[PDB]
């Protein structure tokens, strides 16, 4: 391999369907020559044209060609057909976090605190390099071979979140007051979501969810968080400091890393690289 | 009719090897070149 390495579908052996995205399916595949397993995502050209995401997709490629992180799922490279665009993606052996959560009922303090640091790190990287990222929530997070959290991508297929959509999707919990009301929002929204994610992983369900939509709506704006008495104190503290109405007094990323409870229970370890 | 490699032991063995003994990615997949929109899409 000199400096050519232009790939086609003829360079892959296809294994099994891994799932269906909005734009197209993801297949477990491996390179014929090297036998290196990847997750191949097949986009329909007509679908990305329809939605007017030509620029967004370009930006995804430009970001992924300049930036790398062990807790952000990698784009190795891409090719394209007359009909198709192919993304050669990092394969997440342990699948979707939300699926792992339902199977586990709840995550122990170890797995939860490991994810929270991993995510806090990935997000520090994302804000330093001044790039958009896929909003954090169990559906949008994948798992490595040792349960390392992977943000699925830099969120090019992310749609401007609707109040009505989030209500029906049952994802209203991951929308802070600023978003809920008319008000302007910055990357301080990230801080709220980590607080929500932490509660969800430990308890099994999002803190603000109920049976009524008006109820879930009231509990968010009053930040009416209710912790089960079985909840570890360290965790209750972190979620209390993240889930605050005021964005400007939400525990910053630098201090989520430094938070006693994380320190005490995180078992984060970088996956092996070459050189 | 799923191929043998993408199922059971043969896959978990292949993933385990790929995790603890990964290859040089830059040599395997080359440099990600900017997306040429005129070349790829209509209009």
Author numbering:
A (entry chain AAA): 32 to 306
B (entry chain CCC): 841 to 883
Sentences from the study reporting this entry:
The kinase-activation segment, as shown by the Aurora-C example in this manuscript, is a typical example of such a highly mobile structural element.
We therefore switched to co-expressing N-terminally histidine-tagged Aurora-C (residues 13–309) with a peptide comprising of residues 835–892 of the IN-box segment of the inner centromere protein (INCENP) activator, which had previously been co-crystallized with Aurora-B and which had also been reported to bind to Aurora-C. The resulting Aurora-C–INCENP complex indeed eluted as a complex from the IMAC column, but again the sample precipitated during subsequent concentration. The protein yield was significantly reduced in the absence of INCENP, indicating that both the INCENP peptide and a high-potency inhibitor were required to maintain protein solubility. We therefore designed a triple-aspartate mutation (S193D, T198D, T202D) in which all three Aurora-C activation-segment phosphorylation sites were replaced with negatively charged residues, thus mimicking the phosphorylated and fully activated form of Aurora-C. This new construct resulted in an Aurora-C–INCENP complex which expressed and purified with higher yield than the wild-type protein, but again did not crystallize. The final structure contains two Aurora-C–INCENP complexes in the asymmetric unit. Based on the absence of the salt bridge between Lys72 in the ATP site and Glu91 in helix C (8.9 Å distance), Aurora-C crystallized in an inactive conformation. As the introduction of the SER triple mutant was crucial to obtain crystals, we conclude that the triple mutation enabled the formation of the short helix in the activation segment, which stabilized the activation segment via interactions with the kinase domain and which additionally introduced a new crystal contact. Both the observed new hydrophobic crystal contact and the intramolecular interactions which pin this helix to the kinase core could not be established in the presence of the original arginine and lysine residues in positions 195–197.
